[PDB]
Design a protein around this ligand. Structure first.
Ligand SMILES: *[C@@H]1O[C@H](CO)[C@@H](O[C@@H]2O[C@H](CO)[C@@H](O[C@@H]3O[C@H](CO[C@@H]4O[C@H](CO)[C@@H](O)[C@H](O)[C@@H]4O)[C@@H](O)[C@H](O[C@H]4O[C@H](CO)[C@@H](O)[C@H](O)[C@@H]4O)[C@@H]3O)[C@H](O)[C@H]2NC(C)=O)[C@H](O)[C@H]1NC(C)=O
Ligand SMILES: *[C@@H]1O[C@H](CO)[C@@H](O[C@@H]2O[C@H](CO)[C@@H](O[C@@H]3O[C@H](CO[C@H]4O[C@H](CO)[C@@H](O)[C@H](O)[C@@H]4O)[C@@H](O)[C@H](O[C@@H]4O[C@H](CO)[C@@H](O)[C@H](O)[C@@H]4O)[C@@H]3O)[C@H](O)[C@H]2NC(C)=O)[C@H](O)[C@H]1NC(C)=O
Ligand code: U2P
Ligand code: U2P
Ligand code: NAG
Ligand code: NAG
Ligand code: NAG
Length: 161
């Protein structure tokens, strides 16, 4: 039911993806998304010490030099507080998910957004998730590159039939 999405390295894509490439990071968690989006005052303000505990997750914000904690706080506020109720189980979940992503190619990895590279003739995956979704920037009949791993389809498993 919850969508897990993450960023993948790509020097050709300015922002988080280029920063990950330079830092030798292959996969960095974006968020864990239940159906219910949080509205209003969070039940708890996510501190930098708390958010830093999700080891290896990079901020999408250039203002923190892609470290912590603008993306992390935004994720707790928009998707965390109203569904997890307390910060401790959400940090342990976000951190276990990132620790799993750092290991390499996940069991379920589907492209979300691409940057088509004319030189290598590949759909360089900039964001992926654990379930298939309509693509953005991915060119039809071109193979996908998930932080170096070549896959002919949009997922590292079969969807169709
Ligand atoms: C998918 O995403 C959902 C969120 O939409 C996740 O579900 C949440 O899981 C967390 C645990 O990881 C749950 O948090 C705990 O809630 C306890 C109270 O919950 C009551 O019962 C139902 C649950 O069916 C709730 O819906 C009600 O609102 C009730 O409040 C709460 O007591 C508990 O805290 C205790 O432990 C922590 C430490 O773990 C202490 O810090 C704390 O003081 C206290 O002792 C937790 O906060 C949460 O209830 C779940 N939310 C829902 C809506 O079900 C799934 O886990 C996600 N799954 C995957 C695979 O990603
Ligand atoms: C990771 O991705 C980045 C971005 O795509 C890439 O960086 C680019 O690298 C190229 C080559 O080193 C570089 O090109 C040079 O640009 C200067 C002018 O630069 C100015 O303008 C840029 C915008 O156009 C701006 O980004 C710069 O900061 C700067 O203000 C130009 O003078 C160079 O001279 C030419 O050199 C070529 C050969 O290299 C000759 O054929 C030619 O005649 C000129 O002498 C050259 O074009 C580009 O500026 C970089 N862009 C950015 C954004 O940094 C990295 O290369 C890539 N990393 C890896 C490891 O792949
Ligand atoms: O985790 C993230 C967050 C944002 N982005 C993209 O970077 C820009 C936001 O500054 C935006 O270009 C935004 O595009 P979007 O995510 O909305 O598709 C990422 O790539 N990864
Ligand atoms: O199920 C979903 C799918 C996407 N999103 C948000 O929309 C942005 C673009 O897809 C995604 O980058 C994400 O942005 P965010 O909420 O993390 O700011 C969801 O919220 N839930
Ligand atoms: C991490 O991976 C292991 C093995 O696939 C799995 O048992 C565990 O549930 C995963 N944790 C998360 C947070 O996805
Ligand atoms: C977060 O995950 C890392 C593994 O990358 C682990 O070493 C660390 O103890 C975990 N942190 C918390 C707060 O559990
Ligand atoms: C990134 O991915 C490539 C391809 O899977 C791999 O060769 C490389 O070792 C990975 N880097 C890290 C930091 O795990």
């Amino acid at each position: 039911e919850n969508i897990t999405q993450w960023n993948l390295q790509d020097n050709g894509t300015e922002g988080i993806q280029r920063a990950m490439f330079q830092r030798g990071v292959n996969r960095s968690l974006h968020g864990i998304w239940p159906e219910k989006i949080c509205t209003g005052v969070p039940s708890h303000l996510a501190t930098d010490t708390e958010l830093k505990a999700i080891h290896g997750m990079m901020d999408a914000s250039e203002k923190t030099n892609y470290t912590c904690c603008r993306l992390q706080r935004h994720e707790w506020n928009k998707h965390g507080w109203c569904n997890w109720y307390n910060i401790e189980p959400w940090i342990l979940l976000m951190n276990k998910t990132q620790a799993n992503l750092t290991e390499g190619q996940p069991l379920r990895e589907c492209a979300v957004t691409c940057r088509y590279d004319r030189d290598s003739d590949l759909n360089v995956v900039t964001q992926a998730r654990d379930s298939p979704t309509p693509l953005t920037g991915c060119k039809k009949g071109k193979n996908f590159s998930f932080a170096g791993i070549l896959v002919q389809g949009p997922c590292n498993f079969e969807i169709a039939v």
